[PDB]
Amino acid sequence: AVEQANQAKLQQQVAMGLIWTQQSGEYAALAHQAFNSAKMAFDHAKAKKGKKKAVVVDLDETMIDNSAYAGWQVQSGQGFSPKTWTKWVDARQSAAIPGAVEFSNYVNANGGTMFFVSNRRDDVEKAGTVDDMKRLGFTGVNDKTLLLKKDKSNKSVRFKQVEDMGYDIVLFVGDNLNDFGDATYKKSNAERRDFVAKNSKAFGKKFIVLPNTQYGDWEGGLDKNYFKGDSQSKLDVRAKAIHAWDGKHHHHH
Amino acid sequence: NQQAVEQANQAKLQQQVAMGLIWTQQSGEYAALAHQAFNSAKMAFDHAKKKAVVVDLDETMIDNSAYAGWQVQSGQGFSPKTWTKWVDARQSAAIPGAVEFSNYVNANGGTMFFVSNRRDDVEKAGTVDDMKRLGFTGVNDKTLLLKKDKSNKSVRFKQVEDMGYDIVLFVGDNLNDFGDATYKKSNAERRDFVAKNSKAFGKKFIVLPNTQYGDWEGGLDKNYFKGDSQSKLDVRAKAIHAWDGK
């Protein structure tokens, strides 16, 4: 009873970010800004001698738009679960992020190969993923280039798989810092910020970022045991995460 | 009673921004997006052929997220009175990359102009002090164009040009920061502007994320700010598109 009321409370907190993502011209413009940068970076990159030129991207909230699942969460008050996420994947309703299809198709048509390394499940989420990408017009999605999740959520193993196929990964695109390598994997937000500061020049050059205000490993990054707590535990952790002005508060008749 | 009802609803309106504010304040992702923007801007500036760069301040070069945090905690919505108190509290922070970019422009053949909707009359002093503290060079009576009678920036922009400048680059978190084309328009219209100008972004128009506030809020409905908090909740609810779960 209480736990479900709190779970619903957890979903309501994403509503403004979600509205901004679904409705703002600002979000669409950040998407294009990302892909304009990616195109420029790609055009200027050279693959190592003897290597094939590759670009690696994430799918969810990078090339593909699952914001309708987040909407379902807000409305239903239910948190994420593997079972309902698979159901969403199967409803085959993903949209294209602005700029994504053009960039991806540009790469495959202009001297490079796109790889789609994603944490949708290779075991029950491939079918739906393949159908939506075909519908949206992404070229070059096959057994070679679509690397879905097996046993690990970190992407280094899959990235190395791509390289071992004879490719030089010249560019990485994503909404999660883990989409740029394992450096940030399972780290706290403060640590992930450190990684950013130390690599500040890389972004918009080798690492291309898309905004995702609904979910991600910045959520896990809030506390080492964030997901081991119940919904009240999560609410407390979230509240603690905010920094607030004191308000600058004498008066009487 | 009405008072309690409005208070509960205003609090509800603030709870809805929590995750975006947390993302903004905590995520490495947000910081990387700021650097992506400022890296893009440096490149664009270096290439552009007197040279000026126009930028917004709040949520572009300086970080007022502590004010949004105060809103969430106190359940209070925005008001001009408390905003001015925040500006006077002189606690604004630098957005990542912002100081380096701005000082880079000013020391490398360009002039920075800061066109901002902080009020010229009562928010200039706090603005000047925070920018000196953060290390922003070149902030003066000529380069700091604060708000007078109008929220749109096309008039201040033109003032820049009439001083004999070519504005080669615009930076901002609000589409209005790129000219009046989006001013007072719906989100749908603003999104069409984006599509029609898609190739501009990261080249002449540099975007910073702001999921806390903006004219994307007003763009939800022509009478968004005419209604009470309950009506805002309804508009906000209606703005979300949702999988049916089946």
Side-chain angles (χ1 to χ4, degrees), chain B residues 3 20 54-55 84 87 93 149 154 168 182 194 199 213 224:
Chain B
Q3 297 309 309
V54 167
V55 307
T84 301
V87 168
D149 69 314
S154 68
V168 299
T182 46
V194 170
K199 292 316 191 303
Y213 71 81
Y224 185 75

Side-chain angles (χ1 to χ4, degrees), chain B residues 115-118 145-148 150-161 163 167:
Chain B
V115 195
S116 160
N117 282 342
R118 291 179 162 211
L145 289 76
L146 296 184
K147 200 237 260 74
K148 304 279 205 75
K150 282 166 176 292
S151 280
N152 49 309
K153 292 177 189 185
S154 68
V155 180
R156 280 165 285 182
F157 285 171
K158 289 188 159 105
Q159 291 175 14
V160 165
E161 295 177 329
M163 282 179 299
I167 305 176

Side-chain angles (χ1 to χ4, degrees), chain A residues 23 26 36 193 201 209, chain B residues 26 36 66 100 190-191 201:
Chain A
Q23 293 283 352
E26 290 76 13
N36 298 346
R193 282 190 261 107
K201 295 306 171 180
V209 194
Chain B
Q26 288 288 349
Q36 178 169 268
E100 176 173 341
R190 297 163 69 88
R191 273 189 262 114
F201 299 104

